[PDB]
Amino acid sequence: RDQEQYIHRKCYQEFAHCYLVKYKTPQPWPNEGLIADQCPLPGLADVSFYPYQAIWDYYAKIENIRPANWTSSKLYGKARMGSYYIPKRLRNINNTHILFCSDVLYSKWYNLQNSILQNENELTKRLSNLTIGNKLKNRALPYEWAKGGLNRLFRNISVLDVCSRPEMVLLLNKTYYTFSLWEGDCNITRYNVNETVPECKDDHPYSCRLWRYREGKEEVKCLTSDHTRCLYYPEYSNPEALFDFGFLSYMRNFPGPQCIESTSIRQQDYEVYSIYQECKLASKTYGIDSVLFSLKNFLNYTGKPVNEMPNARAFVGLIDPKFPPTYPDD
Ligand SMILES: *[C@@H]1O[C@H](CO)[C@@H](O[C@@H]2O[C@H](CO)[C@@H](O[C@@H]3O[C@H](CO[C@H]4O[C@H](CO[C@H]5O[C@H](CO)[C@@H](O)[C@H](O)[C@@H]5O[C@H]5O[C@H](CO)[C@@H](O)[C@H](O)[C@@H]5O)[C@@H](O)[C@H](O[C@H]5O[C@H](CO)[C@@H](O)[C@H](O)[C@@H]5O)[C@@H]4O)[C@@H](O)[C@H](O[C@H]4O[C@H](CO)[C@@H](O)[C@H](O)[C@@H]4O[C@H]4O[C@H](CO)[C@@H](O)[C@H](O)[C@@H]4O[C@H]4O[C@H](CO)[C@@H](O)[C@H](O)[C@@H]4O)[C@@H]3O)[C@H](O)[C@H]2NC(C)=O)[C@H](O)[C@H]1NC(C)=O
Ligand SMILES: *[C@@H]1O[C@H](CO)[C@@H](O[C@@H]2O[C@H](CO)[C@@H](O[C@@H]3O[C@H](CO)[C@@H](O)[C@H](O)[C@@H]3O)[C@H](O)[C@H]2NC(C)=O)[C@H](O)[C@H]1NC(C)=O
Ligand SMILES: *[C@@H]1O[C@H](CO)[C@@H](O[C@@H]2O[C@H](CO)[C@@H](O[C@@H]3O[C@H](CO)[C@@H](O)[C@H](O)[C@@H]3O)[C@H](O)[C@H]2NC(C)=O)[C@H](O)[C@H]1NC(C)=O
Ligand SMILES: *[C@@H]1O[C@H](CO)[C@@H](O[C@@H]2O[C@H](CO)[C@@H](O[C@@H]3O[C@H](CO)[C@@H](O)[C@H](O)[C@@H]3O)[C@H](O)[C@H]2NC(C)=O)[C@H](O)[C@H]1NC(C)=O
Ligand SMILES: *[C@@H]1O[C@H](CO)[C@@H](O[C@@H]2O[C@H](CO)[C@@H](O)[C@H](O)[C@H]2NC(C)=O)[C@H](O)[C@H]1NC(C)=O
Ligand SMILES: *[C@@H]1O[C@H](CO)[C@@H](O)[C@H](O)[C@H]1NC(C)=O
């Protein structure tokens, strides 16, 4: 009978937006610190005027009370306080692949105003028209991922993505771009702002000023004998007062300084395989049930199922996975 529809339905409901990205070589995120001023911060006492930003999971939050001989490096490595600390598990040299199940990276053909029927149909059509086996043609990808890219399935990643999808950016960005209003970045100080920024000849109170000024060396001062409760002094100024300065500056709400520097993270072409296309292909040989079982287990490669992870966060690193998985000969 026309088995095709059952295989489509099952493969789609389990693996539609699941993909496997192979780095040319294992190259992890290179710094412990992430400078992303474009994301709003929680602000004073966390009474936040913005919805929860996922990147806040990695926020190096300044605390006023610290023990007597406390340094930021004890908790956040080389990261700046008030920026973000990338934990070791998100910059792991051993990780050769990135597995994700998310629709946030589809280009404009996919848009949630349409009926789900349209989007389902269009995605399966495009995948069939864009795959050699289970491997995507380079034209499906961003050119930044693979030479020949024409965004025919995936969009380019953006500056604001890191705020809602930090793991995706950390694991998949070919290049790290800073967005900074910190004093000293790009040799911009509180003294030469009227000279480095063209449009400043000296209105929003945020105009032509920096966000974080360097106040001095980081230190802990103890004014009691109680050395467990001492006062912390950050190196740069505290951003709670001006919690959305960087975001508002990124939206070009006012003129002023902006520092953007690039760092090449991963070189050479990505390869990308569609788990859905592999489901549909292997089903005609080994049967839908075993293909389903084996690819579900592959999605559980780390003990946490990637497709049971939130759509914005379902991006995981893998160490030398066998793909396709062995299919049971039953
Ligand atoms: C994960 O990966 C993601 C994907 O890889 C990644 O997303 C990408 O991030 C990067 C970095 O953020 C993005 O690239 C940036 O794009 C910026 C914006 O580009 C547009 O706007 C600028 C400015 O536009 C002004 O001028 C035009 C005319 O020129 C006007 O039409 C505008 O209206 C505007 O005019 C004024 O008005 C605005 C308010 O309305 C003001 O805000 C504005 O500042 C003006 O005052 C244009 O220049 C751009 O033109 C480009 O157009 C296309 C591409 O769009 C190209 O074909 C073309 O060649 C132009 O590049 C565009 O329209 C850019 O500003 C930004 O450029 C800076 O960074 C790069 C990389 O380092 C530099 O090479 C570049 O020269 C710029 O660096 C200078 O400026 C920065 C600060 O901006 C300094 O820190 C730096 O030191 C340097 O200064 C030196 O040079 C200056 C000359 O520029 C000089 O003046 C200085 O004095 C100094 O000597 C950069 O290109 C990219 O778009 C993202 N991609 C996507 C798909 O989103 C993501 O970030 C990654 N995430 C993480 C976490 O890593
Ligand atoms: C990249 O992979 C290597 C190899 O898997 C990782 O090194 C290994 O790290 C584990 C802990 O994550 C070590 O296991 C421990 O070994 C001690 C013996 O000293 C044992 O008593 C513990 O119960 C535990 O099993 C393992 O020794 C270590 N192996 C080597 C060769 O270094 C490495 O950490 C990975 N890198 C990253 C950044 O994750
Ligand atoms: C996603 O990112 C890529 C960059 O890797 C963008 O590709 C670039 O797109 C621009 C405009 O579409 C191309 O420039 C144009 O070239 C033609 C040549 O005929 C010229 O007539 C135009 O005036 C303009 O200069 C550029 O070549 C192209 N670069 C590459 C490497 O393909 C792409 O547009 C981005 N898409 C989105 C939606 O952000
Ligand atoms: C993805 O793989 C992980 C294995 O890394 C699976 O976790 C396993 O989940 C089962 C279900 O509860 C656990 O079995 C039970 O464990 C308890 C306590 O250890 C034991 O007393 C019971 O007799 C029973 O065997 C199992 O321990 C656990 N394994 C680990 C290492 O945590 C997970 O279920 C898999 N997810 C999917 C969707 O398949
Ligand atoms: C999708 O399939 C079409 C087949 O129609 C591929 O090529 C298109 O061919 C028609 C003529 O039949 C041209 O008019 C189109 O311009 C072609 N498409 C493009 C995008 O140029 C197409 O390459 C396949 N891939 C995608 C991503 O659509
Ligand atoms: C900042 O100054 C240093 C030298 O002190 C120089 O190497 C660097 O390129 C400068 N950066 C910018 C953005 O001007």
Side-chain angles (χ1 to χ4, degrees), residues 2-194 196-303 305-330:
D2 44 291
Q3 264 290 267
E4 268 338 288
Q5 213 174 219
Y6 181 64
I7 288 139
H8 152 77
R9 181 59 190 153
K10 297 287 273 173
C11 290
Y12 191 99
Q13 45 179 184
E14 283 284 339
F15 310 116
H17 324 289
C18 297
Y19 303 85
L20 185 74
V21 176
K22 176 177 179 271
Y23 299 138
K24 193 107 207 148
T25 50
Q27 292 167 284
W29 193 268
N31 330 306
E32 316 186 11
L34 171 62
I35 301 289
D37 279 13
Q38 66 263 40
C39 313
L41 287 173
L44 171 133
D46 321 276
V47 188
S48 155
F49 289 69
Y50 286 79
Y52 152 87
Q53 304 295 289
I55 201 184
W56 296 349
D57 290 356
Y58 308 117
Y59 184 34
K61 180 174 155 97
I62 292 174
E63 295 288 345
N64 287 341
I65 307 290
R66 288 307 192 174
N69 257 324
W70 195 91
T71 305
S72 95
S73 54
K74 306 197 23 154
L75 223 55
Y76 301 114
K78 289 152 234 184
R80 289 182 199 168
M81 288 309 272
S83 70
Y84 306 85
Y85 169 67
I86 305 317
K88 281 143 171 33
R89 60 162 206 288
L90 282 177
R91 38 177 183 82
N92 180 347
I93 182 54
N94 288 337
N95 277 332
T96 65
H97 292 56
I98 306 296
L99 168 62
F100 67 85
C101 299
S102 163
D103 63 7
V104 316
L105 278 182
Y106 292 137
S107 37
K108 26 158 182 273
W109 63 270
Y110 185 94
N111 95 77
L112 291 315
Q113 323 322 112
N114 293 355
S115 60
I116 205 181
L117 296 172
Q118 263 181 240
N119 286 333
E120 239 155 69
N121 204 255
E122 186 53 26
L123 167 62
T124 75
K125 229 206 264 189
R126 293 204 169 231
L127 282 178
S128 211
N129 191 26
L130 278 157
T131 48
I132 302 163
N134 64 19
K135 175 168 158 174
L136 279 176
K137 304 199 245 265
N138 282 6
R139 70 191 271 108
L141 311 186
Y143 183 90
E144 198 174 349
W145 290 14
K147 286 114 193 169
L150 294 171
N151 288 114
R152 296 260 67 216
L153 188 72
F154 292 130
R155 73 185 168 78
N156 300 342
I157 295 175
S158 78
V159 170
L160 283 179
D161 269 317
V162 80
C163 308
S164 36
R165 302 106 182 205
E167 294 85 7
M168 163 186 99
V169 178
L170 289 169
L171 296 169
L172 289 169
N173 254 46
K174 292 279 215 86
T175 301
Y176 168 37
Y177 295 93
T178 50
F179 185 84
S180 177
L181 286 89
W182 300 65
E183 171 175 26
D185 283 351
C186 291
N187 303 315
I188 301 182
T189 74
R190 67 183 110 189
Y191 299 125
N192 67 6
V193 49
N194 65 354
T196 38
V197 187
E199 55 238 35
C200 290
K201 333 288 179 133
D202 202 314
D203 224 354
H204 211 287
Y206 296 3
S207 304
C208 293
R209 29 168 290 101
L210 290 153
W211 188 6
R212 253 77 68 104
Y213 297 87
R214 215 197 101 93
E215 317 256 341
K217 330 86 199 163
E218 141 188 81
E219 61 202 34
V220 171
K221 293 189 211 174
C222 301
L223 284 131
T224 65
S225 38
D226 179 359
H227 288 2
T228 88
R229 300 228 336 146
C230 301
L231 184 58
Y232 183 63
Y233 289 79
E235 174 168 357
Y236 299 88
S237 77
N238 203 294
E240 289 188 328
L242 278 40
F243 54 96
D244 59 354
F245 201 118
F247 175 58
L248 291 189
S249 162
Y250 175 66
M251 306 275 77
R252 300 184 298 141
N253 273 230
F254 50 87
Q258 281 183 349
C259 178
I260 294 164
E261 292 161 303
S262 95
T263 318
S264 183
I265 278 190
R266 287 126 195 163
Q267 300 87 51
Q268 298 191 284
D269 278 3
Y270 287 175
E271 295 177 84
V272 192
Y273 316 90
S274 160
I275 311 285
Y276 167 83
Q277 203 59 22
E278 166 71 20
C279 183
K280 154 185 193 240
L281 284 192
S283 276
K284 62 201 47 178
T285 293
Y286 305 91
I288 184 52
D289 288 356
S290 41
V291 172
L292 231 52
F293 179 85
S294 194
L295 288 178
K296 261 160 161 291
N297 199 221
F298 181 77
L299 287 201
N300 196 32
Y301 195 92
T302 70
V306 191
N307 65 324
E308 287 172 18
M309 308 184 38
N311 194 60
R313 319 297 293 288
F315 295 75
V316 169
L318 302 188
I319 300 180
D320 200 54
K322 178 195 166 175
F323 187 83
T326 88
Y327 291 109
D329 297 341
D330 312 348

